[PDB]
Amino acid sequence: QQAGTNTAENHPQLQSQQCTTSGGCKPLSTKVVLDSNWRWVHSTSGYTNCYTGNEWDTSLCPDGKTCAANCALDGADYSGTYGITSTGTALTLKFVTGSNVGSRVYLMADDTHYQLLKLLNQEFTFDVDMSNLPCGLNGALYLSAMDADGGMSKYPGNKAGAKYGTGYCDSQCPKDIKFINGEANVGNWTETGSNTGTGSYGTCCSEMDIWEANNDAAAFTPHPCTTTGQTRCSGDDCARNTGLCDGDGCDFNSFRMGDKTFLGKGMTVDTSKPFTVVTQFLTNDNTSTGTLSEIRRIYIQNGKVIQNSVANIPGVDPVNSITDNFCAQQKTAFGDTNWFAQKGGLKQMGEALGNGMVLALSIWDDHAANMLWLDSDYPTDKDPSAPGVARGTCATTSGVPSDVESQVPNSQVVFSNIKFGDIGSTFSGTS
């Protein structure tokens, strides 16, 4: 895609903190940028759209290379069009704004580069307010193995780059991404909704889901891919699980793991109020070159340090962190193939972490599975009493996009106090 000039692109500021054991925490002047899928795309020499609703203009876009040459991504009115605001330390992402549904933004080091976080033998910490984030919605904070420049160095047809939010990829190898590898994804374009479609290519990469949640359920999930970095796929390589990527991931959702009273409204972690979420990425030898061996989770709310809940599933050791062994155990228990281990398990997740990953923050609804996988029974054809089926208490009928968008359009999530650095250094304790 080209870089448009009709609307100035001004990235909201979202300060973060980098922390070290000896030095404490220091501010970084990071920013956020809207993902390229949500943007206006128009002819480079004017105002005519290249994409409207759920279709491309085939005159401007007869093939992916010609489309990318002819079409430009432009600047965004963050609050007015997308319902995205920042105080400079707290990011509010509103659900419906006019005809726009949801958003995804990336954390930037500067106006042309995503922040590349290297979190081996490090931790990541943030505050979240899900008070107004219900069943069917997902306020997600996560890592993708994207390039810091959004792909510009690799793909001559991408002249827009990180400044315009290009180069997404994730463990689901999505085929709804409009620009991949510098080409518009227009081949065999198929409508999937009023504003969305899919093309013949998907875009794959390893993903660490630090946080997928609403006030009914939360999950943290590594998803390794056998490939390294952002990879365009065709055919069954795009196929979830069986292709390049573990689409399912090794998840730790307290409720799915057999503890139905840890996290939710009025629970130990009270989702009706803000709280702090710490995620630590331990290596087997406590070094940054070591092998990712454990992902630990600690919560803080009202100054109380809250350790993660323990698993309570027959056949699964009663642990409260993600490990290779916990993954093998919960996949057998749940009847899920260990696509995670097949792709290289925590070791492979860890090398993606070591190579550097981009932070995404988002609010969305789920046209495919209605968020049931997060907060209800899934699959919708399995017995809810079976281990792993039930992931929350949302109704099996909730989360249909058309219902949530009219009933709770002013839902939002707030992400704030973003910190990363040495293990134990982004937060403190005392007696």
Ligand SMILES: *[C@@H]1O[C@H](CO)[C@@H](O)[C@H](O)[C@H]1NC(C)=O
């Ligand atoms: C790594 O740190 C852990 C604390 O989480 C500690 O228990 C262990 O002794 C350390 N291991 C090595 C080999 O230094």
